[PDB]
Amino acid sequence: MKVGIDAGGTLIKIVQEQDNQRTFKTELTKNIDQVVEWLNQQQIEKLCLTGGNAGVIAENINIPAQIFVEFDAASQGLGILLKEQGHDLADYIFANVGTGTSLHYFDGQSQRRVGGIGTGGGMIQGLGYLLSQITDYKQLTDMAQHGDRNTIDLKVRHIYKDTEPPIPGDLTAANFGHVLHHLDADFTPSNKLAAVIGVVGEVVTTMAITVAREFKTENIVYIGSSFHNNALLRKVVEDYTVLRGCKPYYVENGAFSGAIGALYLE
Amino acid sequence: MKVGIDAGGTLIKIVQEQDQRTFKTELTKNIDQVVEWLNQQQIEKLCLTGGNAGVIAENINIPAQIFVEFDAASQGLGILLKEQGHDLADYIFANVGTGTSLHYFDGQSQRRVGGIGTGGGMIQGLGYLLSQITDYKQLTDMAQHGDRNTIDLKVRHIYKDTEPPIPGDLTAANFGHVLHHLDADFTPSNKLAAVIGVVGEVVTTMAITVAREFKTENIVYIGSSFHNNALLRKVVEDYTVLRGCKPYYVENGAFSGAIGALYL
Numbered sequence: 141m142k143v144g145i146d147a148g149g150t151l152i153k154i155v156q157e158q159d160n161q162r163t164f165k166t167e168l169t170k171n172i173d174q175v176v177e178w179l180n181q182q183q184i185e186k187l188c189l190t191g192g193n194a195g196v197i198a199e200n201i202n203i204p205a206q207i208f209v210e211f212d213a214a215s216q217g218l219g220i221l222l223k224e225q226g227h228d229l230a231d232y233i234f235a236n237v238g239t240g241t242s243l244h245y246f247d248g249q250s251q252r253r254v255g256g257i258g259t260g261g262g263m264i265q266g267l268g269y270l271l272s273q274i275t276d277y278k279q280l281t282d283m284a285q286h287g288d289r290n291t292i293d294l295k296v297r298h299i300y301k302d303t304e305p306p307i308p309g310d311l312t313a314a315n316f317g318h319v320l321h322h323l324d325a326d327f328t329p330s331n332k333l334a335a336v337i338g339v340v341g342e343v344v345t346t347m348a349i350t351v352a353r354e355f356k357t358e359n360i361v362y363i364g365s366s367f368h369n370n371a372l373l374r375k376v377v378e379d380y381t382v383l384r385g386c387k388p389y390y391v392e393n394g395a396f397s398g399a400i401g402a403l404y405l406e
Numbered sequence: 407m408k409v410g411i412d413a414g415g416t417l418i419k420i421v422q423e424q425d426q427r428t429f430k431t432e433l434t435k436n437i438d439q440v441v442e443w444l445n446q447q448q449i450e451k452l453c454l455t456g457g458n459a460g461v462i463a464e465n466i467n468i469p470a471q472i473f474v475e476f477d478a479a480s481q482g483l484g485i486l487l488k489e490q491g492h493d494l495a496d497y498i499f500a501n502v503g504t505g506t507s508l509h510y511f512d513g514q515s516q517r518r519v520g521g522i523g524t525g526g527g528m529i530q531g532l533g534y535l536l537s538q539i540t541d542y543k544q545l546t547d548m549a550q551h552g553d554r555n556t557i558d559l560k561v562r563h564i565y566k567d568t569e570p571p572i573p574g575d576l577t578a579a580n581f582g583h584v585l586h587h588l589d590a591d592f593t594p595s596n597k598l599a600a601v602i603g604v605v606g607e608v609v610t611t612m613a614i615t616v617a618r619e620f621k622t623e624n625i626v627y628i629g630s631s632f633h634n635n636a637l638l639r640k641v642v643e644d645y646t647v648l649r650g651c652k653p654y655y656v657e658n659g660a661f662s663g664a665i666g667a668l669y670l
């Protein structure tokens with residue numbers, strides 16, 4: 141058994157390989173001690189680590205472990221997954237929407253980090269909590285899928301009214317910009333959470349399309365566990381990527397790109 | 407008297423020229439009062455721009471020229487920069503209004519190179535949801551000495567005792583420390599500082615990205631979102647500098663569009 145681990149800020153992704161049978165396992169980073177205990181009882185032929193919490197694992201386990209930089213690991217694993225799933229992309233932006241968001245240009249050969257932003261899954265959870273008091277991820281995301289953003293977000297057409305706007309009227313002009321115009325109207329937990337997801341999605345996508353233009357690629361691959369149990373986030377991102385003339389791709393087990401990559405790096 | 411008006415989503419900026427230049431701000435909610443004021447005046451030249459220009463034009467009883475806000479903003483900003491002793495060959499300008507519009511000025515003309523809904527509208531709206539404060543001066547004042555430490559997650563918090571691949575002091579996740587501090591008091595000042603933080607960081611990130619793309623080191627920040635918000639100015643300024651770019655603020659930068667409308 142070969143094991144790759146991407147121990148990130150919020151989730152630990154574990155890939156176990158045995159004779160080309162893969163196991164994909166998610167654990168909370170808060171439960172890292174259990175991952176360590178588990179590892180110490182396993183028969184491991186090779187162990188590769190990546191992510192911010194790789195060191196916490198390495199220092200507490202009884203076996204050697206190779207450690208890799210998460211950006212290279214993510215790129216390597218993502219390339220593997222893309223090819224397995226029948227995407228032959230000459231080049232692409234990849235946006236890793238984790239606790240935070242890291243943006244990369246893959247030129248066909250190697251990755252380069254071309255940007256990043258603190259709008260990601262961490263913000264969804266944290267700001268989500270401040271606005272709703274919900275700490276449970278599944279509960280938080282499920283609720284948001286039922287939300288309406290109309291009373292919260294301001295569109296271009298709301299600013300331009302009955303005049304022709306210089307960019308499309310349906311675009312978000314200001315996230316949370318309708319709130320002060322709806323002070324009688326209600327800001328239900330679902331509606332508020334949908335708007336949080338909305339801003340995070342729009343920001344990530346905006347950054348991704350911008351660097352896509354900069355590096356002259358139309359392909360944008362979105363990965364990260366922030367897309368799990370969040371159809372709304374996937375939709376916000378997908379729709380706006382398409383609107384901007386780019387091609388969005390999601391990847392089966394994309395959140396495990398780093399963990400897979402760690403196993404296959406030299 | 408010549409008059410230029412930039413009637414935006416939140417504020418109406420009025421520039422009056424007689425000889426002497428005068429600057430006046432009114433709330434877009436009070437657009438009816440601007441209209442009343444205009445209808446009394448003998449105006450030799452009246453120019454309008456911004457989203458609510460049409461509401462003004464359709465309720466006034468005189469003619470008016472209407473200009474596109476992007477060109478107007480560029481024109482007026484160029485004028486202000488020269489008046490204030492800047493000779494910039496080229497630059498990004500970021501207009502942080504209700505929403506945020508990004509432009510590359512090549513020395514000759516502007517091109518819109520991006521935009522984002524993180525701006526002054528979000529500061530007010532999300533600020534309200536987290537603090538129940540509707541008064542702008544109260545909201546921004548309350549944010550000024552907030553502490554973001556219990557709210558925001560840094561790169562070094564994720565990487566712990568290992569060397570991170572990007573600087574450890576960088577924000578990794580806005581609001582990403584909240585779940586690690588559930589026993590803590592999320593005070594209104596702390597929450598609002600975090601709101602300003604995310605807006606500032608997003609705007610700056612976009613500006614520095616297009617600055618790299620279009621090969622300019624100069625980033626000029628305008629918009630009324632910088633009024634009564636030293637913290638926003640600081641978040642933006644510090645991160646722009648960190649990213650190897652030169653940030654500029656402009657006296658009356660928020661009136662760039664209103665001035666520009668007069669001179670187009």
Ligand SMILES: Nc1ncnc2c1ncn2[C@@H]1O[C@H](COP(=O)(O)OP(=O)(O)OP(=O)(O)O)[C@@H](O)[C@H]1O
Nearest residue numbers: 148149150151238239240261262277364365366368
């Ligand atoms: N079971 C879960 N528990 C908590 N968050 C989850 C869960 N499933 C999905 N998420 C979402 O995924 C995000 C984490 O994504 P991911 O695992 O890609 O990041 P990470 O690798 O831990 O973070 P980073 O790469 O920034 O260190 C969370 O912030 C949350 O939005």
Ligand SMILES: Nc1ncnc2c1ncn2[C@@H]1O[C@H](COP(=O)(O)OP(=O)(O)OP(=O)(O)O)[C@@H](O)[C@H]1O
Nearest residue numbers: 414415416417503504505526527542629630631633
């Ligand atoms: N007195 C005030 N009242 C309300 N908001 C204010 C005030 N002073 C500054 N602001 C801030 O300025 C922002 C509006 O900035 P600005 O005047 O540049 O936008 P706008 O032109 O009205 O909007 P847009 O160009 O996106 O249509 C507000 O969202 C708020 O953050």
Ligand SMILES: COCCCCCNC(=O)CCNC(=O)[C@H](O)C(C)(C)C
Nearest residue numbers: 240241242256257258561576577578607
């Ligand atoms: C002082 O901070 C200014 C704000 C800078 C914002 C830019 N932040 C980033 O690029 C980091 C975003 N987060 C990430 O890339 C990931 O979460 C890692 C895990 C930190 C790589």
Ligand SMILES: COCCCCCNC(=O)CCNC(=O)[C@H](O)C(C)(C)C
Nearest residue numbers: 296310311312313505506507521522523
């Ligand atoms: C459907 O949502 C699409 C995502 C929108 C993201 C981009 N939005 C924008 O660029 C508009 C931002 N706002 C602005 O430029 C200004 O506020 C104006 C006044 C609308 C020009």
Ligand SMILES: [Mg+2]
Nearest residue numbers: 148149238239
């Ligand atoms: Mg990660």
Ligand SMILES: [Mg+2]
Nearest residue numbers: 414415456503
């Ligand atoms: Mg404006």
